[PDB]
């Protein structure tokens with residue numbers, strides 16, 4: 001085992017467990033009993049005060065369940081480990097995700113650190129204490145795991161790596177991102193070979209489950225959503241106001257935007273539906289403004305030293321808008337997600353977004369979710385299927401910012 | 407200390423060391439009393455005579471009371487001894503259940519040898535020339551931090567085997583009480599009951615015998631429990647003509663306790679009495695409504711009602727009703743109105759709202775608690791139509807989901823009293839609001855109110871505009887604030903203003919509200 005310690009002075013987490021559904025509970029039971037059998041984890045006593053939450057999520061295209069531990073807090077108190085994310089990956093044609101988490105089950109965990117991996121299986125209506133264990137092996141989801149296993153991992157990958165270096169292989173937590181430019185067919189092929197190379201070179205010491213319906217992400221086609229202005233035929237007082245509003249807002253970002261002319265068109269106390277004729281003057285001001293928005297504001301760069309943020313907005317109808325920036329008004333990306341029910345949608349989007357963040361910057365963002373905590377807490381596990389968990393917060397967006405997107 | 411129980415290793419909070427607190431000498435009456443007890447204990451192995459090589463010591467006095475407070479301050483935190491308490495409706499029916507008080511409770515479990523030295527205490531010797539006797543616990547000392555949790559722990563492992571040998575049987579450990587029920591012909595039960603005692607006894611654990619045990623029903627944690635039915639421990643509503651703020655709060659408190667089983671309790675009126683009160687001992691005369699309410703509650707409470715238990719076979723059904731503004735009630739049964747539980751919800755989440763928003767929130771709470779009790783979500787029966795729900799749905803910028811649910815035509819039906827035009831109304835006057843308004847048809851009114859917030863002024867303006875306009879009206883504003891509120895479409899609010907406004911809105915045929923940046 002490799003000695004690992006929490007960041008100086010910090011103590012282990014003592015997070016509370018969220019109630020679960022009998023069904024989900026039973027899953028973890030089966031799972032853990034097995035893991036115990038195989039010495040991966042072992043029941044712990046009361047001399048252990050720590051606890052991380054645990055969940056059961058489903059493996060899509062699988063009959064089996066998956067355990068997901070919320071090591072988020074732990075990872076934050078886990079000393080850093082004093083491969084740089086590949087700029088190439090984002091650029092590739094197609095990327096597929098593999099769940100190489102089980103590979104971790106091999107490496108032993110510094111005994112002195114195990115106690116902190118304490119997690120519990122709740123009991124319905126608190127009618128029984130509740131099963132408590134801690135890890136003995138590297139746990140999936142723990143920051144340390146990929147690091148420690150990095151070693152064996154670079155090795156086991158060396159061959160295939162240089163064998164056909166046309167493919168980019170990136171690991172993030174329990175995820176392995178494989179990027180190529182191959183033809184969709186050749187891709188899925190060389191993809192299956194890696195799976196095998198992996199099994200056939202036992203890190204599983206089962207072939208690597210795909211993530212995301214096995215489906216592939218095409219980062220190549222990830223385009224940013226430019227702001228847009230209505231292309232009205234005839235402009236009513238109302239339309240114009242709504243136009244000026246939006247513009248004013250966007251002016252914050254793009255300083256060259258001007259509304260002086262459009263604002264004139266709105267002299268006095270006219271009636272909302274009264275149709276106003278665009279004047280040559282204003283006509284060329286809109287046009288300009290319109291041209292300015294055609295692209296993302298210049299000068300927005302990613303600073304690895306700052307947190308990545310992501311807010312999502314509901315546009316109703318099953319459509320969603322979202323943005324990723326590290327500084328207000330200075331987005332690094334923006335997109336949308338379309339259709340089920342709200343939550344399902346949201347979780348899908350979050351994961352989708354995270355997955356990109358990872359692919360682009362090899363880091364998870366901090367989402368701002370437009371929903372009520374209790375609701376999220378209740379259903380997210382029902383559709384969640386990634387192996388990581390982003391950091392989130394809950395907000396009540398102003399129906400103004402929504403009106404300025406899509 | 408000979409025992410079959412594996413000990414839980416204990417350690418003191420980091421850096422900290424054992425307690426070295428002085429012993430306050432005792433009279434010779436006290437000294438003897440201790441010695442006698444301490445010796446019995448030595449005989450039983452619970453403690454052991456140690457040498458003056460142990461630099462530690464906790465105070466003791468006179469029965470024996472060892473104060474471990476300090477040690478407790480120096481002992482590591484253990485895992486939360488039993489988090490939440492199980493609710494009666496989450497249980498399964500039992501042909502019979504027996505309760506066992508756990509004797510020798512803590513005084514029957516081995517203590518991490520490595521940690522015993524810290525439990526060291528000394529009984530002074532009568533003669534002053536001579537030194538005193540130094541002992542140390544060998545078991546879970548009564549009153550010590552670990553004791554509970556550790557015992558709890560141990561207990562379950564002891565139970566562990568037996569449990570498997572008797573899957574049929576069911577045991578619940580709760581403090582120094584052990585609850586066990588089955589659906590075994592009576593005697594078979596009592597029999598198993600005996601096996602149990604013996605099995606425990608097989609690890610030094612003693613327990614009360616059949617004639618000494620308490621018998622159903624069982625009053626625990628405030629309820630009354632029978633093997634097949636449950637309820638709230640009886641509530642007696644005092645009778646008097648002088649209620650004190652204090653009296654009131656208690657009653658209201660008690661009243662709530664009921665609500666979980668007794669449907670229809672109402673506290674609105676009593677609660678109201680507490681307004682502006684100045685002392686717990688201030689006497690508030692009951693209002694006419696209060697009397698009425700109390701009386702009514704008197705009647706409900708008069709007849710004993712009882713909750714049923716959980717049958718994992720059948721489904722869970724939850725029914726909701728609005729029993730007043732921002733006030734809802736519900737009930738969970740599996741078998742038609744054969745309630746497992748009932749309850750209310752008065753949670754006003756946010757300064758403004760609407761039944762749709764609330765009813766939705768109600769559902770959530772229910773959902774949350776169901777999971778917490780029966781590990782599943784109940785199908786819902788709601789007084790709202792899908793169409794109504796969905797409408798609000800799409801509109802709302804916030805996400806939300808309501809599990810499977812069916813419409814119930816049990817008035818009052820939740821609906822939306824109004825809805826802003828998505829497009830500005832043609833031929834309707836257009837008011838521009840900023841403290842007054844100016845419309846496209848030349849009209850205006852500028853009022854200056856005394857004592858008002860900037861945010862509140864905004865709303866008032868709008869208000870004015872609503873008042874003075876016809877059935878259809880366009881309204882332009884620069885208050886994102888006021889806009890968000892209204893756009894949300896509240897049907898109830900803490901502020902009267904909003905309510906007045908709401909009143910106006912509901913009346914209008916059509917209303918278009920718009921925003922425009924100010925200045």
Ligand SMILES: CCN1c2cc([N+](=O)[O-])ccc2N(C)C(=O)c2cccnc21
Pocket residue numbers: 126127128492497498499500503576577578580585586587588624626631632633634
């Ligand atoms: C069989 C156990 N038992 C019961 C269980 C319980 N728990 O799980 O937290 C708490 C109390 C309790 N008691 C006291 C009972 O009398 C009871 C009644 C009916 C069924 N199970 C009952």
